[PDB]
Design an enzyme around this catalytic site. Structure first.
Site, short mmCIF file in Angstrom:
data_model
loop_
_atom_site.label_atom_id
_atom_site.label_comp_id
_atom_site.label_asym_id
_atom_site.label_seq_id
_atom_site.Cartn_x
_atom_site.Cartn_y
_atom_site.Cartn_z
N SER A 76 0.77 -1.20 -0.05
CA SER A 76 0.15 -0.01 0.05
C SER A 76 0.97 1.23 0.09
CB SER A 76 -1.05 -0.10 1.02
OG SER A 76 -2.02 0.83 0.63
N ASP B 164 -10.13 -4.61 -3.24
CA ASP B 164 -9.43 -3.69 -2.52
C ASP B 164 -10.21 -2.52 -2.15
OD1 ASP B 164 -7.69 -1.92 -1.15
OD2 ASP B 164 -5.96 -2.71 -2.04
N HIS C 132 -7.77 -5.78 0.63
CA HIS C 132 -6.30 -4.85 0.57
C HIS C 132 -5.44 -5.70 1.14
CE1 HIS C 132 -4.23 -1.35 0.47
NE2 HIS C 132 -4.19 -0.98 1.87
#
Length: 262
Positions: free
Chosen positions: A132, A178, A209
């Site tokens: 991320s 996600d 995610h």
């Protein structure tokens, strides 16, 4: 002959397995320099020096989210450092700086005779990974340091999706469902921005995610792809060209794209 090739000829089964050929040890970095904390995973018996990979978590997250990559990659012939950031709330540019500080410290320890990794690292061959904002940090690291030999972020996010300058071979793991860094607005436009590199986009069906994090249900495929990408591009190892570049033809994959990857 390729001076960087390590280990036996790969197969699908050997890359999908729990571990590669090399015995892995680990240690906690006693005095982290430029980042919050780190764990180094290394092969004891790779048969030559190996490249180094630094892996960074996402916002609020810690090494636990990314730890599974350490033994998995190291067992195939890499020194891997997983970090905690100085603050859990650091943003991607800071995460990139800390990722490069972690690579620096691996290089320092390679030259420290008391360290377990003394002489185990080829400091000219390095890679970046992360989740991320740590994945966006990996792309920033690659854009600012084009000598890096591979990048493989997961569920990436950055403030700008434009990584058009990146020449480093980049594999993007994406997670279909996600809701934090949605594929359509994060991973895919980051992938599409890169015109100058070998690149790949691999989206896991049904993934939240965290779909590439420790404990995920797709370690066979995700681990095969991460190791193959790093072997092909960090070690120039053409025994891995097909594994790195192929559509894996997996019902766990919902979108696959690649470019400049034969």
């Amino acid at each position: 002959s390729n001076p960087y090739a390590r280990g036996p000829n790969p197969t699908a089964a050997s890359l999908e397995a729990s571990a590669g050929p090399f015995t892995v040890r680990s240690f906690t970095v006693s005095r982290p320099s430029g980042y919050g904390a780190g764990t180094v995973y290394y092969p004891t018996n790779a048969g030559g020096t190996v490249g180094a990979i630094a892996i960074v978590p996402g916002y609020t997250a810690r090494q636990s989210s990314i730890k599974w990559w350490g033994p998995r990659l190291a067992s195939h012939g890499f020194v891997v450092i997983t970090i905690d950031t100085n603050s859990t709330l650091d943003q991607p540019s800071s995460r990139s700086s800390q990722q490069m500080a972690a690579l620096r410290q691996v290089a320092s320890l390679n030259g420290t005779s008391s360290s377990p990794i003394y002489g185990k690292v080829d400091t000219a061959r390095m890679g970046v990974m992360g989740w991320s904002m740590g994945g966006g940090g990996s792309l920033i690291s690659a854009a600012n340091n084009p000598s890096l030999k591979a990048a493989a972020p997961q569920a990436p996010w950055a403030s700008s999706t434009n990584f058009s300058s990146v020449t480093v071979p980049t594999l993007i793991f994406a997670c279909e469902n996600d809701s934090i860094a949605p594929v359509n607005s994060s991973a895919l436009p980051i992938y599409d921005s890169m015109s100058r590199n070998a690149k790949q986009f691999l989206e896991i069906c049904g993934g939240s995610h965290s779909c590439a994090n420790s404990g995920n249900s797709n370690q066979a495929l995700i681990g095969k792809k991460g190791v193959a990408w790093m072997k092909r591009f960090m070690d120039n190892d053409t025994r891995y060209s097909t594994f790195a570049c192929e559509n894996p033809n997996s019902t766990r994959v919902c979108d696959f794209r690649t470019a400049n990857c034969s």
